[PDB]
């Protein structure tokens, strides 16, 4: 209540405070507790193999230099005080681009406690790398992580833990990605060794399951409809050369445009995906349908009836094997 | 352990410290050791002729002004101390755009040693120029370098070396580019002379071998399938003018759309690539197939049978010569 008294107390705390030295410098490591509140996952990019996360990132640690007596309150201080305090040198090892939000002020909090506990909060948006296995795309499940580490302090000097254990990360229910469901999240703690020493690590990972629905509509269904279209040829008289050859060409070429378009939406991976396998199967069906007519055409100068039954049935077999293997 | 003692020692180190003067100013050059830990190569762009690298960049040098006694520890200091120290004026001569990561703090480390050795670490993402020879694209091998140099200090004042020799660069195994394999990396050291004097240089280069698989599927296979499609015409009766002319047109025009689309994904180079040679060969085959029908059409108002054998065989020869020359 007495602002001169509080001002005196805080001035005394910061008098001769050396930001260069961690709490308990030269002694046991400072334990830093970390909790995350997820605001959003804005984007997941296959082409860039990354995702964009917004979170409230909070760090908890005790600094005995900041302990104060005679005030039974937690002091919430203006965020600019953070520049006069030691804070951990935490970074995100797999981040590509990150920033602290700055409007209307730096989205930063400092709360001091009488025992010298410092609560330091930041609102961060990060684009973080996530290597994806697209062999089953778009029936794939991905593991995207956020790796949290101390940059310069080893485990001799700093230690990390998930504050609250399995409850340290909140807001996973808020994530609303149209193309993915969050199956699970996990929290891990370990030490990572480099040439410069052993460093504390915290890892947050998510299991993402792709929703098929968009892909059924966008790629699978057009391919099915083109393949069915190709079969119309077999009901046309063999003298209708222009009509039946037109059907063969248009379906074959449409399947090429669909294939090439699709792979321009994705990174230039050297392996075959699940969707590639489907499109290649569909291409073979429609190509053989045209070749069937070439064969009929070839001898006329029963086969059509045989095509009317065998082709749709074979496509059913193809689909059965495919969707069983991958679903 | 005694933080007042450590604070006193460090304050004494920085008292009267002149950041303007290099260590041993006016004396022998300061030797700066450099090690790199590669985190990722995010992107390789043919259109922009550049690549994006993320690395941990560490510099090692001795500054006798920072030597301290009576403390048998290496002092890890808050990264903000870097602003009160001399550091080398290292830059990347072939970089296009670079930044030091800034969340949650500047990804920077300072570790002092009792003898005055300074360890200075930065986490940097750089987009760096890489002129590519696309004459064999996409069967090409590229050499992309990172050129590290002192901006203003000559070899009279500063010297660079790879700290650890051939082990100075780690993490090459981490690089996971879908379109490339890292064949080799090399470390070079030399002096580079300009009008203003001789400057120390360190060069890190990689040999990148393009993976063919994506290109086989995306460009080569469609071209093969269009060329085969063109041959169907030869099994159609010569009276089927609409059917056979349709086949000729559609294949010819599809090969044009494939060509023009492809070169819109690449920079506007004035020379012919390997892929251009293939597409031009395929174009000639399908164009001649249509012209074959024009010739048949021309006289009817044996040639088809001759086309049925000679065309596929010639395409086999074309492919044999091509893939031997380039693979």
């Amino acid at each position, epitope marked *: 209540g007495n602002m001169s008294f509080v001002k005196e107390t805080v001035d005394k705390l910061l008098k001769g405070y050396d930001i260069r030295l961690r709490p308990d410098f030269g002694g046991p490591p400072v334990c830093v507790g970390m909790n995350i509140d997820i605001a959003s996952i804005d984007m997941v990019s296959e082409v860039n193999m990354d995702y964009t996360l917004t979170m409230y990132f909070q760090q908890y640690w005790r600094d005995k230099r900041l302990a104060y007596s005679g005030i039974p309150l937690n002091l919430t201080l203006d965020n600019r005080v953070a520049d006069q305090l030691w804070v951990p040198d935490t970074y995100f090892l797999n981040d590509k681009k990150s920033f602290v939000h700055g409007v209307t002020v730096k989205n930063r909090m400092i709360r001091l406690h009488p025992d010298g506990t410092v609560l330091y909060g930041l609102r961060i948006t990060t684009t973080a790398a996530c290597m994806m296995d697209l062999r089953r795309y778009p029936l794939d499940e991905q593991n995207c992580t956020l790796e949290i580490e101390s940059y310069g302090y080893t485990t001799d000097d700093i230690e990390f833990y998930w504050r609250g254990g399995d409850k340290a990360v909140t807001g996973v229910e808020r994530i609303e990605l149209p193309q993915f469901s969050i199956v699970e999240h996990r929290l891990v703690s370990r030490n990572v060794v480099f*040439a410069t020493g052993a460093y504390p690590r915290l890892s947050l990972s998510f299991r993402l399951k792709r929703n098929i629905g968009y892909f059924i509509l966008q790629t699978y269904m057009p391919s099915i409809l083109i393949t069915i279209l190709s079969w119309v040829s077999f009901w046309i008289n063999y003298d209708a050369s222009a009509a039946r050859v037109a059907l063969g060409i248009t379906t074959v070429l449409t399947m090429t445009t669909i294939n090439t378009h699709l792979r321009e939406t994705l990174p230039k991976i050297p392996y075959v995906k699940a969707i590639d396998m489907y499109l290649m199967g569909c291409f073979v069906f429609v190509f053989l349908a045209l070749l069937e007519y070439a064969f009929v055409n070839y001898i006329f100068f029963a086969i059509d009836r045989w095509s009317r039954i065998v082709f749709p049935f074979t496509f059913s077999l193809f689909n059965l094997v495919y969707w069983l293997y991958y679903v | 352990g005694n933080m007042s003692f450590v604070k006193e020692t460090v304050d004494k180190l920085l008292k009267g410290y002149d950041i303007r003067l290099r260590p041993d100013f006016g004396g022998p050059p300061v030797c700066v050791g450099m090690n790199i830990d590669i985190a990722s190569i995010d992107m390789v762009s043919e259109v922009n002729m550049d690549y994006t690298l993320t690395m941990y960049f560490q510099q090692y040098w001795r500054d006798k002004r920072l030597a301290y006694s009576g403390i048998p520890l290496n002092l890890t200091l808050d990264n903000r101390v870097a602003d009160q120290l001399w550091v080398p004026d290292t830059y990347f001569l072939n970089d296009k755009k670079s930044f030091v990561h800034g969340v949650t703090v500047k990804n920077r480390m300072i570790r002092l040693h009792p003898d005055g050795t300074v360890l200075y670490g930065l986490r940097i993402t750089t987009t760096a120029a890489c002129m590519m020879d696309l004459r064999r694209y996409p069967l090409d091998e590229q050499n992309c370098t990172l050129e590290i140099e002192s901006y203003g200090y000559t070899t009279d004042d500063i010297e660079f070396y790879w700290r650890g020799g051939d082990k100075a660069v780690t993490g090459v195994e981490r690089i996971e580019l879908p379109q490339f394999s890292i064949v080799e990396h090399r470390l070079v050291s030399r002096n580079v002379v300009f009008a203003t004097g001789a400057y120390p240089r360190l060069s890190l280069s990689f040999r990148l071998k393009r993976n063919i698989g994506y290109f086989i599927l995306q460009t080569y296979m469609p071209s093969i399938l269009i060329t085969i499609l063109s041959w169907v015409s030869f099994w159609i009766n010569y009276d089927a003018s609409a059917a056979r002319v349709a086949l000729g047109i559609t294949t010819v025009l599809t090969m044009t759309t494939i060509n023009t689309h492809l070169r819109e994904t690449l920079p506007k180079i004035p020379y012919v690539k390997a892929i251009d040679m293939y597409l031009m060969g395929c174009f000639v085959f399908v164009f001649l197939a249509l012209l074959e029908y024009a010739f048949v059409n021309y006289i009817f108002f044996a040639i088809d049978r001759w086309s049925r054998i000679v065309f596929p065989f010639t395409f086999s020869l074309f492919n044999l010569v091509y893939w031997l020359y380039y693979v």
Partner: nanobody, 121 residues
Framework: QVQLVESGGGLVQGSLRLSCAAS????????MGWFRQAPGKEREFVGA????????SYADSVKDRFTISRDNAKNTVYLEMNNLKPEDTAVYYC??????????????????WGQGTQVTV
């Protein structure tokens, strides 16, 4: 979740080919390492290979003697131990490293350890 079974050790006087067959979530663990533990001595780095690319690294002791490579079809890594020596007498272990799990050289960075073939010469 990775399982590693290694075989082809034994006792010889000579060229040898240790093999290391992986199964499971190998995507999350792109690096395979070879370690060896002599009786008494600490567990020691031999070499490592990326599954994708085959980017290879060796300890000095075995540089230009041993050769590692793999085949992604079988999910198998092999240590081709040529030009053997009586120093090369240890339980050779195979292990998998996570993508972000630190330096190649340090066995504590590795999660999934093979059984370990004893090799004496």
């Amino acid at each position: 979740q990775v399982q590693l079974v290694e075989s082809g050790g034994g006792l010889v006087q000579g060229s040898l080919r240790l093999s290391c067959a992986a199964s499971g979530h190998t995507f999350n663990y792109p690096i395979m390492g070879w370690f060896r533990q002599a009786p008494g001595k600490e567990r020691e780095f031999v070499g490592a290979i990326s599954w994708s690319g085959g980017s290879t690294s060796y300890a000095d002791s075995v540089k230009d003697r041993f050769t590692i490579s793999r085949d992604n079809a079988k999910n198998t890594v092999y240590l081709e131990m040529n030009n053997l020596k009586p120093e090369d007498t240890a339980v050779y272990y195979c292990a998998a490293k996570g993508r972000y799990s630190g330096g190649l050289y340090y066995p504590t960075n590795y999660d999934y350890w093979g059984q370990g073939t004893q090799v004496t010469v």
